[PDB]
């Protein structure tokens, strides 16, 4: 179609800007998932990006942890409004923290991401990360306002594990990956994934990388204007906040099933996607969030899904509720600064795609 051609052109233009590679999966109503790629999986080997290359999805993981949690709500063992003192009795302010605040970025919890060394081989524990957060972050009052929280999701993961008696990867695999045939999806803290299949991730030595969000010391020198950051950070360090590995294809599988109502009942899905308040994420198109899903605005279209930033892999997934379209776009270029083109600019091709879809429907 002319749509195919416009979309490939969008991805082509984006890599021509200096993005190493990009992988897209897009499903439209009444149609199969279409896959598109441009540029390279591996910059130095000049290996072409395919629909089978795996990426670290970063915070897109949170949508799966939220889903996992809401599933345990359905099982009747968890209440979205009950205090987390049940699982975390000695956690400061826990009595003011209902289960839901862990998912909605309004808990005031101290965060760990900006203090955590991104270059490391340390195997982290969920509790280590929690203790590390309280050591290095600033805690605010629950319900102070929205401030993006990775710690809330780590604690969510710990609930999943206590309520099921196994690592949270087991719950996500049996209740989500298996039933939907997501065969190319892994949970990084608790599962070994095949590195040889992963697209390489690239941090760019860019001029607009002024205020890096990460401790990226120990990097060494850039080759051809980039670092290969694929294996800088062990995924256990992100844990339930960003440890998943997947393909745009598998992500769209998840997204179709979620919005179709084939995972969560009507009430848990409404909670995830419709029970919303305003939300900010620096550099991004985020305007609101629910309990596991961000609302990201692209002119006259909006996606409900998530963004993900983990060194070298930059992702946007979501569902446009008006058009029915589900998408996951991951590039293997990034930087440290939220406002860098290599981070924030992942939104440009996304915006262009939603407007091309719109055109072909007008
Ligand atoms: N926006 C993101 O995708 C990152 N917060 C994911 C992440 C969590 C924890 C550590 C590193 C990375
Ligand atoms: Ba500086
Ligand atoms: Ba390492
Ligand atoms: Ba509109
Ligand atoms: Ba037209």
Which listed ligand is nearest to 232 at the C-alpha? 3
Query: How far, in whole angstroms, is CA 41 from its chain's centroid?
Result: 19
Domain ranges of the chain: 1-362
Contact 111, 133 (CB under 8 A): yes
How far lies 7's CA from each of 26, 305, 352, 360, in Å? 10, 20, 8, 11
Q: Please give the Cα distance from 269 to 69 (Å, whole number).
A: 12
Cα(292) to ligand 4 centroid in Å equals 23
- The residue whose CA is least distant from atom 11 of ligand 1 is 238
**Token reading at 12:** 């082509």
* Ligand 1 atom at shortest distance from the alpha carbon of 59: 3
How buried is residue 183: exposed, middle or buried, by Cβ count under 10 Å (0-12/13-18/19+)?
A: exposed
Cα(73) to ligand 1 centroid in Å equals 25
If DSSP states are collapsed to H, E and C, what string results for the chain?
A: CHHHHHHHHHHHHHHHCCCCEEEEEEECCCCCCEEEEEEEEECCCCEECCCCCEEECHHHHHHHHHHHHHHHHHCCCCCCCCEHHHCCCCCCCHHHCEHHHHCCCCCCCCCCCCCCECCCCCCCCHHHHHHHHHHHCCCCCCCCCCCCCHHHHHHHHHHHHHHHCCCHHHHHHHHHHHHHCCCCCEECCCCCCCHHHECCCEEECCCCCCCECCECCCCCCCECCEEECCCCCCHHHCHHHCCEEECHHHHHHHHHHHHHCCCCCHHHHHHHHCCCEECCCCCCCEEEECCCCEEEEECCEEEEEEEEEECCEEEEEEECCCCCCEEEEEECEECCECCCHHHHCCHHHHHHHHHHHHHCCC
Q: Where does 1-362 sit in CATH, by number?
A: 3.40.710.10
Q: Please give the Cα distance from 266 to 94 (Å, whole number).
A: 29
Q: Please give the Cα distance from 315 to 303 (Å, whole number).
A: 13
Q: Please give the Cα distance from 195 to 154 (Å, whole number).
A: 24
Contact 251, 53 (CB under 8 A): no
The torsion defined by the Cα of 9, 14, 15 and 16, in degrees rounded to 10, comes to: 80
Sheet holding 186-187, edge to edge: 55-56, 244-246, 186-187
Q: Is the CB of 310 under 6 A from ligand 1?
A: yes
Please name the residue that has the structure tokens 């524990």: 125
* Ligand 1 atom at shortest distance from the alpha carbon of 315: 3
Centre a 10 Å sphere on the Cβ of residue 178 and count the other Cβ atoms it contains: 11
Q: Is the CB of 150 under 6 A from ligand 1?
A: yes
Query: How far, in whole angstroms, is CA 138 from its chain's centroid?
Result: 23
Q: Is the CB of 309 under 6 A from ligand 1?
A: yes
**Token reading at 121:** 């081989």
**Nearest in space to 313 (alpha carbons), one of 258, 248, 239, 267:** 248
Please name the residue that has the structure tokens 């029915």: 324
Q: Please give the Cα distance from 343 to 19 (Å, whole number).
A: 10
Contact 196, 64 (CB under 8 A): no
How buried is residue 329: exposed, middle or buried, by Cβ count under 10 Å (0-12/13-18/19+)?
A: buried
Contact 291, 179 (CB under 8 A): no
CB neighbour list of residue 343: distance below 8 Å, 6 or more residues apart: 283, 309, 314, 334, 335, 336, 337
Q: Would residue 312 be called left, alpha or beta, if left means φ above 0 and alpha means ψ between -120 and 50 degrees?
A: left
Sign of the CA dihedral 257, 260, 261, 266?
A: positive
Which experimental technique did the depositors report for determining this structure?
A: X-ray
Query: How far, in whole angstroms, is CA 319 from its chain's centroid?
Result: 14
Q: Please give the Cα distance from 318 to 329 (Å, whole number).
A: 9
Provide the angle, in degrees to the nearest 10, between the axes of the packed helices 61-74 and 150-164: 40
Resolution (A): 2.2
């Amino acid at each position: 179609s002319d749509l195919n051609n416009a979309i490939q052109g969008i991805l082509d233009d984006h890599v021509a800007r200096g993005v190493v590679g990009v992988s897209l999966a897009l499903c439209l109503p009444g149609e199969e998932t279409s896959l598109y790629q441009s540029g390279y999986a591996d910059k130095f080997n000049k290996m072409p990006m395919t629909g089978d290359h795996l990426f670290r999805i970063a915070s897109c993981t949170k949508s799966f942890i939220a889903t996992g949690l809401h599933l345990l709500v359905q099982d009747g063992t968890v209440d979205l409004d009950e205090p987390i003192t049940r699982w975390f009795p000695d956690l400061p302010k826990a009595a003011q923290m209902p289960v839901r605040i862990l998912l909605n970025h309004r808990s005031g919890l101290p965060d760990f991401e900006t203090s955590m060394p991104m270059i490391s081989d340390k195997s982290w524990t969920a509790q280590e990360i929690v203790d590390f957060s309280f050591r290095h972050g600033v805690q605010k009052e629950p319900w102070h306002g929205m401030e993006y929280s990775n710690t809330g999701y780590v604690l969510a993961g710990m609930i999943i594990a206590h309520e099921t008696g196994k690592p949270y990867s087991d719950h996500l695999r049996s209740r989500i990956f298996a039933p939907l045939g997501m065969k190319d999806t892994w949970v990084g803290t608790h599962e070994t994934f095949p590195i040889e299949r992963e697209a390489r991730g690239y941090m760019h030595a860019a001029a607009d990388d002024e205020n890096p969000q990460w401790d990226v010391s120990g990097a060494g020198d850039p080759v051809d204007g980039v670092w290969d950051s694929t294996e800088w950070f062990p995924l256990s360090g992100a844990n339930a906040a960003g440890d998943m590995v997947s393909t745009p294809r598998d992500i769209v599988k998840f997204l179709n099933a979620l919005f179709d109502g084939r995972i969560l009942d009507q009430k848990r899905l409404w909670e995830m996607k419709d029970n919303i308040k305003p939300a900010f994420f620096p550099g991004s198109n985020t305007v609101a969030n629910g309990h596991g899903l961000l609302l990201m605005r692209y002119g006259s279209s909006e996606l409900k899904g998530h963004l993900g930033q983990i060194p070298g892999h930059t992702s946007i997934m979501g569902r446009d509720e008006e058009t029915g379209a589900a998408l996951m776009l991951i590039q293997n270029s990034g930087a440290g600064d939220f406002e860098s083109f290599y981070l924030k600019g992942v939104n440009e091709p996304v915006d262009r795609v939603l407007e091309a879809i719109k055109n072909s429907r007008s």
